[PDB]
Amino acid sequence: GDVLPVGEHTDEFPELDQAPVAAIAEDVVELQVVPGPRDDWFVDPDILVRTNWLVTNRSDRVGMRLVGMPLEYRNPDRQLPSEGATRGAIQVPPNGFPVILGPDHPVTGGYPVIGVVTEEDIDKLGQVRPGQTVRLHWAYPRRP
Amino acid sequence: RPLIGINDGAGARIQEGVVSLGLYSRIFHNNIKASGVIPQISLIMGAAAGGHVYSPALTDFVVMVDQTSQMFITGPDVIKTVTGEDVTMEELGGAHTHMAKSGTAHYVASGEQDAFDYVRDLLSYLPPNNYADPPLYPVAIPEGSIEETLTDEDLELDTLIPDSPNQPYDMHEVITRILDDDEFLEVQAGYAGNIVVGFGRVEGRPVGIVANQPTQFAGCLDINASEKAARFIRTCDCFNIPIVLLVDVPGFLPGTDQEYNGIIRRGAKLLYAYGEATVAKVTVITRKSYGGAYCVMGSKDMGADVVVAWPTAQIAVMGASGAVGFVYRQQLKEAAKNGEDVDALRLELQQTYEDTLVNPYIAAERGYVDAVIPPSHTRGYVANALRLLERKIVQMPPKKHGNIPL
Amino acid sequence: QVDIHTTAGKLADLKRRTEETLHPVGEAAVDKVHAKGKLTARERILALLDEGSFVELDALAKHRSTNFGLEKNRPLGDGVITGYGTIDGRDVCIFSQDATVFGGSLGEVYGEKIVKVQELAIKTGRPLIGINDGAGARIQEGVVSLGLYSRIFHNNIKASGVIPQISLIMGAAAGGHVYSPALTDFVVMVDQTSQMFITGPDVIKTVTGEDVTMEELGGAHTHMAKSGTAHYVASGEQDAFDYVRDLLSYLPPNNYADPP
Amino acid sequence: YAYGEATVAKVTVITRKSYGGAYCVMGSKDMGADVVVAWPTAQIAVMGASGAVGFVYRQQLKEAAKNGEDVDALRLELQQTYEDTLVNPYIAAERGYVDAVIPPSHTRGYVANALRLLERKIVQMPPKKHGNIPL
Amino acid sequence: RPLIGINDGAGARIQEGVVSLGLYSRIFHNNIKASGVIPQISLIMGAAAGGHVYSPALTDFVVMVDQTSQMFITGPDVIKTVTGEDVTMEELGGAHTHMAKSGTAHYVASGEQDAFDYVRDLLSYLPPNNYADPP
Amino acid sequence: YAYGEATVAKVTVITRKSYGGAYCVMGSKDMGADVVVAWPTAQIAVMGASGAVGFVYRQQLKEAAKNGEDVDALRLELQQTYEDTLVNPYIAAERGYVDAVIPPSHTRGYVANALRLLERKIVQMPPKKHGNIPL
Amino acid sequence: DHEAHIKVLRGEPTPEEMAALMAVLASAGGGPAEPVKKERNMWGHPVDKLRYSVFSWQRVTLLERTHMRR
Amino acid sequence: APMQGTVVKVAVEEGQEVSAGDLVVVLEAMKMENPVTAHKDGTITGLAVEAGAAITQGTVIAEI
Amino acid sequence: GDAVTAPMQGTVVKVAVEEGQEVSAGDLVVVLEAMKMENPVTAHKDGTITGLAVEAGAAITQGTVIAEI
Numbered sequence A: 001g002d003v004l005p006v007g008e009h010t011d012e013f014p015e016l017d018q019a020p021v022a023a024i025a026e027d028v029v030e031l032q033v034v035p036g037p038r039d040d041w042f043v044d045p046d047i048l049v050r051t052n053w054l055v056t057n058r059s060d061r062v063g064m065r066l067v068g069m070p071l072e073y074r075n076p077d078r079q080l081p082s083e084g085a086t087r088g089a090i091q092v093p094p095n096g097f098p099v100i101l102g103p104d105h106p107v108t109g110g111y112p113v114i115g116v117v118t119e120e121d122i123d124k125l126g127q128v129r130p131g132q133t134v135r136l137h138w139a140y141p142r143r144p
Numbered sequence B: 001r002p003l004i005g006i007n008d009g010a011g012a013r014i015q016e017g018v019v020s021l022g023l024y025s026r027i028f029h030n031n032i033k034a035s036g037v038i039p040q041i042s043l044i045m046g047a048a049a050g051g052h053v054y055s056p057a058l059t060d061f062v063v064m065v066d067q068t069s070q071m072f073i074t075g076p077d078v079i080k081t082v083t084g085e086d087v088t089m090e091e092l093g094g095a096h097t098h099m100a101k102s103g104t105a106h107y108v109a110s111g112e113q114d115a116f117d118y119v120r121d122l123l124s125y126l127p128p129n130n131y132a133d134p135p136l137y138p139v140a141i142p143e144g145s146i147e148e149t150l151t152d153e154d155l156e157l158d159t160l161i162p163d164s165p166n167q168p169y170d171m172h173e174v175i176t177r178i179l180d181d182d183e184f185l186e187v188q189a190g191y192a193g194n195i196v197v198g199f200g201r202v203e204g205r206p207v208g209i210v211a212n213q214p215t216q217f218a219g220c221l222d223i224n225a226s227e228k229a230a231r232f233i234r235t236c237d238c239f240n241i242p243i244v245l246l247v248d249v250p251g252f253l254p255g256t257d258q259e260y261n262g263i264i265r266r267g268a269k270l271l272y273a274y275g276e277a278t279v280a281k282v283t284v285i286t287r288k289s290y291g292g293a294y295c296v297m298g299s300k301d302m303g304a305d306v307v308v309a310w311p312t313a314q315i316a317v318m319g320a321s322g323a324v325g326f327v328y329r330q331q332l333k334e335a336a337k338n339g340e341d342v343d344a345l346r347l348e349l350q351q352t353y354e355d356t357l358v359n360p361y362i363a364a365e366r367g368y369v370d371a372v373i374p375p376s377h378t379r380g381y382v383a384n385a386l387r388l389l390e391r392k393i394v395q396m397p398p399k400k401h402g403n404i405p406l
Numbered sequence C: 001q002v003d004i005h006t007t008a009g010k011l012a013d014l015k016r017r018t019e020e021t022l023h024p025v026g027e028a029a030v031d032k033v034h035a036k037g038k039l040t041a042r043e044r045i046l047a048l049l050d051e052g053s054f055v056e057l058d059a060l061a062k063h064r065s066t067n068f069g070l071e072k073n074r075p076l077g078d079g080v081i082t083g084y085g086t087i088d089g090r091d092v093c094i095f096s097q098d099a100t101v102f103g104g105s106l107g108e109v110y111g112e113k114i115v116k117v118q119e120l121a122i123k124t125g126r127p128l129i130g131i132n133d134g135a136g137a138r139i140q141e142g143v144v145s146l147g148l149y150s151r152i153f154h155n156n157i158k159a160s161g162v163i164p165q166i167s168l169i170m171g172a173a174a175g176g177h178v179y180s181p182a183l184t185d186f187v188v189m190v191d192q193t194s195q196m197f198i199t200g201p202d203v204i205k206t207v208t209g210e211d212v213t214m215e216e217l218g219g220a221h222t223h224m225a226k227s228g229t230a231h232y233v234a235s236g237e238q239d240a241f242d243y244v245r246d247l248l249s250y251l252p253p254n255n256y257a258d259p260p
Numbered sequence D, F: 001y002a003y004g005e006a007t008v009a010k011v012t013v014i015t016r017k018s019y020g021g022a023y024c025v026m027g028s029k030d031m032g033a034d035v036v037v038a039w040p041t042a043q044i045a046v047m048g049a050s051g052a053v054g055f056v057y058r059q060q061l062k063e064a065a066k067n068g069e070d071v072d073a074l075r076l077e078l079q080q081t082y083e084d085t086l087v088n089p090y091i092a093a094e095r096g097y098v099d100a101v102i103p104p105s106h107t108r109g110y111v112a113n114a115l116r117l118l119e120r121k122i123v124q125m126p127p128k129k130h131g132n133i134p135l
Numbered sequence E: 001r002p003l004i005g006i007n008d009g010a011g012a013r014i015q016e017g018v019v020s021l022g023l024y025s026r027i028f029h030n031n032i033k034a035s036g037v038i039p040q041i042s043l044i045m046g047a048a049a050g051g052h053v054y055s056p057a058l059t060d061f062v063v064m065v066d067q068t069s070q071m072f073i074t075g076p077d078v079i080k081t082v083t084g085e086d087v088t089m090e091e092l093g094g095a096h097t098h099m100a101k102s103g104t105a106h107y108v109a110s111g112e113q114d115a116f117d118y119v120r121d122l123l124s125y126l127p128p129n130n131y132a133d134p135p
Numbered sequence G: 001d002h003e004a005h006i007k008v009l010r011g012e013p014t015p016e017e018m019a020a021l022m023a024v025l026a027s028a029g030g031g032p033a034e035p036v037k038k039e040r041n042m043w044g045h046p047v048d049k050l051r052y053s054v055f056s057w058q059r060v061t062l063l064e065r066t067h068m069r070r
Numbered sequence H: 001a002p003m004q005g006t007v008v009k010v011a012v013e014e015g016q017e018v019s020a021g022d023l024v025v026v027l028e029a030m031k032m033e034n035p036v037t038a039h040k041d042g043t044i045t046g047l048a049v050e051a052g053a054a055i056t057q058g059t060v061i062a063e064i
Numbered sequence I: 001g002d003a004v005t006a007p008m009q010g011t012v013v014k015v016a017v018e019e020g021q022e023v024s025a026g027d028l029v030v031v032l033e034a035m036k037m038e039n040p041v042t043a044h045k046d047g048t049i050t051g052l053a054v055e056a057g058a059a060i061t062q063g064t065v066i067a068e069i
């Protein structure tokens, strides 16, 4: 029963009947991740790209919560000074399961960002449903 | 006689000298000689490294096993040394990589037995060589007219096409209904899914199907589909297998990525393959065939032998939305100056253009479509046409070989 | 009517157009043809070919001319019926000219349709039957029709000695219509209802003063006993088709086949 | 037959009339004339205007008589209109049945140049043992 | 004998409709027949759009003029509507893009006279047909 | 495919490296190069000596590492012995995969001789409609 | 007599069971396989589609052989 | 079930008659409780799901 | 059924839970390495781990029962 107004249109007119678009993947989604900045916090960060992550039912517009091989902190008692965050940043809360921030993410985060999905791929996160598999690859060589 | 190679190997045996490279050169030169003479099939069932990869590439069909086989020229350790890219051998050369990305594999078997079963299926369609007759199965042709012999499975085609020109449908619903037993051996099923290519039979005759798939990129042609279909067509033409095209193409896939990667140079491959091919070539047009993609997908002057269209076909230079902007730019300027309801005028003009010209009947009037048929007629029409066209003589200027755009 | 913006409605419209291809100038002209006792161009094909074997090409074609008001009347098929089918189970390509549409005179699209079935026959190596009944070139279209006549004659010369070509003459062939038969291998005429002549009695009278009927000038008896151009003179259209099926029973499909 | 069969270089120069079926016989383009040139005086038509205007403008030229008009003059005006419009090389040139319309003096140059271009030809015909020319 | 096309473009004439597509199909079929038989050269000297681009692609050599010729299948505004990227005709399809990126061009001339010079140079090496010897 | 198919005269001049599969692609003798010559500086090998020695001497390079020896200096000594033994034109000349090893100045002489003699090559492929180049 | 007959190698049926066997086998038996009117028609035979070098021996041992073999 | 989620409530009895617009089940998913609403009057036949069970999209909750 | 079963033939690189631990649907049970990739196995129902029959470093066949409930 909500009523939505339709705005006044510009003078331009629709000149194309349809756009071809690549079909959205049904299960395994593969993403290109820029490494770090806090990838040195972990005992073995390449588990991030070696793991078939599974998307949990907790995923929403604030963030997508994965399960997989736990990531191990190099110093598990180390606290992080809270820092700015962005859509597609892959946080690793101290339980070791990654979270990929969505559009409604808080402006600053409390957990180390192990990587960020490239702008090429962030919008694919917008379509991944719970129960899909995710694979990650480093967008360029991670070296400390 | 067909040659089957089963390939595993860590490339050249490094302790043997350049002799091993001489033997590679001889094996490659034989694959080139045999190219288009005998069916060549490569099974890859392990890591094929270095020179082991180029013989498969020169053979006609590549079958891989989905986790136990890889192909790569340069190993992960050299890639790491030269670029820093830390990659597993499966990510580098795996069967999924060579299907979905590189386009090299033709099939990805779930196991070795499944790979052998697919290779036997392939061999069952091919003749032993480019001059022997193809292996027809015995099929008894029923008597009476095409309209007298419609099955209920044919009548399921009359309701297939969605009413909206833009709602997609699975083209396999056509392919499996016009092929015998619904039997269809798809080739490169995982690669460039906007075009479907593969073998079937029509009244026992082997045929190659090439069909636009509306469910991917709305059926547009792109670089990968153009190469997928071009080599399949040239493989059928080597071995005298008739081709049947199912056309439903809105155009080429727009984008700067396609332009910068060479859609002009590599789309011209499918023109070359179809114009060169001298087998029987039947086109069935289902919905769209626009612009240059009409030329590519089996146009009459590209030497399509029989072209039939369904009532839902749409053969036009471009979609009416784009065409009206040229064809009536005068009236649209006058209406803009007069401050008229320009959008309502554009809708009136567009619906007039669609009703008048975006249909099969203009191409039928000009003889580019030999008949417009009820969709259910398609199986009978295609079979009857292949039976007419089973022998062709076509004159071509004498040449050493063509110069297909690479 | 079913909404044309729907798939079922587009199929109903195709069925409507196909129905309109059976009588493109109205049933009254088919009734005139039957009152004259001749078959229609379609019935000639369906009587010659084996039942249900006829597959029609370019059924929905319409002429493109706008000279002298032709754009006001665009009959479907453009006055010729073209296709293929079987005689005694062997495939043949066929065309049959319809004297009800512009007198059967050859236009541009008419010629393109004949050229199409010629090229199909030459390609596939199958006999070609032509049924001829047309008042020459369609004068309103001008020289385009002469270019189509040249293209048809050139295809008859290409096919000459490659595939068996048979011509049935079943009405008045005037002007250019006479040479394609003369280039084919066998000409079968019907003894009182067909003629061939290059130019008609009125021109012959004007130039020479000879006064002559079309029947004496170019009838089937004249072209048998005098000119030597006809190979059979059938008592009627069924007898002509029976002679054509007899002829085809002796001939191979092409010069690279053995006689059956 | 002989002209359509011949595969040597075939050049056609059209001077004055080329009417009807005799245009088809005498070196028409679609009979495989390699180069067709016409002089300005060429007249390419289905038939002479006096015959065509008896067939076009039919009914119109008889309702003129039923209205009592001087159809004997009207038919001459229709003839002049038909000849001025259609009985010339340019309709065939517009259809590309004549490859060039040339000043008559150009004929020797065009013929020599055409023959020099056409001195080598490949033309391919269906395979046959021999033709069946009308005897 | 060699065939030179000086392609300029703007695609199919939209008012004429499907006949322009059938004529494109015929032109492409002849480019394929001629492929490997006679040397084919395409000079691009304007915005070759749509159907105009496949014929050059089927010819043997494509010479483009640097700042003043373009090739693309589909224009920047349809690209903008689908892909959202803004691009100019020059960036999308200029001679630099078809040399360095797409690999479709064989030469990028500094001007039309330089393009003609390069075409004459090519022809100086190529024979008239595959049955002839190189000069 | 293009090189193996080509039936014109084919000459190869090797100047430094020709390693691995690129030896095969760049005009190897068994691919049907008509004349192969190499400069004194040519280096024809299955792979570069670094990569080759690490593989061929796996036994010694593991054993020395378990002994804790100067494996790096051992690798340099083995690599030098391999480069001096096998990475030269002479093993290919011994196999006859290079027809002559020549002073570089002789290159134009050998090329011109070959091109003058091979202007007609009496060579053929198995009959085919066409090949099936990987596309 | 030198025809190859059907043998009931084991069993001893009655004439009714013989008749049933024969009527089954006789109506199962294949029809006109290898048909009597397999005409020759060399139009567009694949051997004519191949490119042959002007000196190719296959012009003798394939092309001419295939046309002339009867 | 319009999505994968956990059946936090099943709101009706086996065989129970239901009216269009009543609730059959509630699924936790998307960090949100999603109600499942009956689209027609009928009888809840063979209620195949248990409270706290996880289920996958497109599974039948009941026939209607 | 109440059995958690291995979806693939692989090696147990990490056991995440112990018997009598409470678990909720979608909690991690074990990780299997195969083909150089590591894959989670997760609880299908709320309950508590019983019948635990695998250990880190065990290579297990496809369909191996890991635990119940």
Ligand SMILES: CCC(=O)SCCNC(=O)CCNC(=O)[C@H](O)C(C)(C)COP(=O)(O)OP(=O)(O)OC[C@H]1O[C@@H](n2cnc3c(N)ncnc32)[C@H](O)[C@@H]1OP(=O)(O)O
Pocket: B009, B010, B011, B012, B013, B014, B015, B047, B049, B050, B051, B075, F020, F021, F046, F047, F055
């Ligand atoms: C142009 C082609 C070239 O240049 S070949 C250069 C690359 N060849 C290589 O040897 C390195 C790349 N790949 C490998 O060799 C790997 O072994 C591959 C094929 C990927 C498989 O690895 P994996 O299954 O672990 O085998 P491995 O390394 O333990 O070797 C097993 C036995 O095979 C042998 N082997 C292997 N490759 C070669 C070769 N190219 N030439 C000669 N021998 C080779 C190994 O020496 C070993 O034999 P052994 O156990 O030492 O008796």
Ligand SMILES: CCC(=O)SCCNC(=O)CCNC(=O)[C@H](O)C(C)(C)COP(=O)(O)OP(=O)(O)OC[C@H]1O[C@@H](n2cnc3c(N)ncnc32)[C@H](O)[C@@H]1OP(=O)(O)O
Pocket: C102, C103, C105, C134, C135, C136, C137, C138, C139, C140, C172, C173, C174, C175, C176, C200, D020, D021, D046, D047
């Ligand atoms: C190749 C060089 C040429 O110019 S050859 C041109 C030949 N012209 C003619 O013969 C004129 C046609 N008049 C005739 O009498 C013919 O010989 C025919 C039709 C064969 C005699 O048959 P008949 O049974 O007497 O019929 P009809 O003449 O009464 O038929 C009149 C209807 O046919 C039409 N028709 C006829 N010929 C043409 C023609 N060439 N071009 C255009 N229309 C033609 C008449 O217009 C008339 O049709 P309608 O009733 O007016 O709709």
Ligand SMILES: CCC(=O)SCCNC(=O)CCNC(=O)[C@H](O)C(C)(C)COP(=O)(O)OP(=O)(O)OC[C@H]1O[C@@H](n2cnc3c(N)ncnc32)[C@H](O)[C@@H]1OP(=O)(O)O
Pocket: B291, B292, B317, B318, B326, E009, E010, E011, E012, E013, E014, E015, E047, E049, E050, E051, E075
């Ligand atoms: C299968 C082929 C297709 O689908 S082509 C479909 C799209 N056709 C195009 O318009 C080509 C792409 N368009 C462009 O990017 C530019 O407009 C092109 C044509 C390349 C260059 O035009 P430009 O130099 O800007 O001139 P302009 O836009 O002022 O137009 C000048 C006159 O040319 C005409 N014109 C142009 N293209 C066409 C065409 N395809 N069909 C018909 N007419 C065309 C314009 O109407 C205009 O005529 P006028 O001078 O305004 O009377």
Ligand SMILES: *C(=O)CCCC[C@@H]1SC[C@@H]2NC(=O)N[C@@H]21
Pocket: A058, A062, A063, A064, A065, A085, A099, A105, A106, A108, A109, A110, A111
């Ligand atoms: C849902 O579980 C995703 C939560 C993502 C936002 C919250 S806010 C408080 C924590 N701090 C942070 O950076 N992300 C977490």
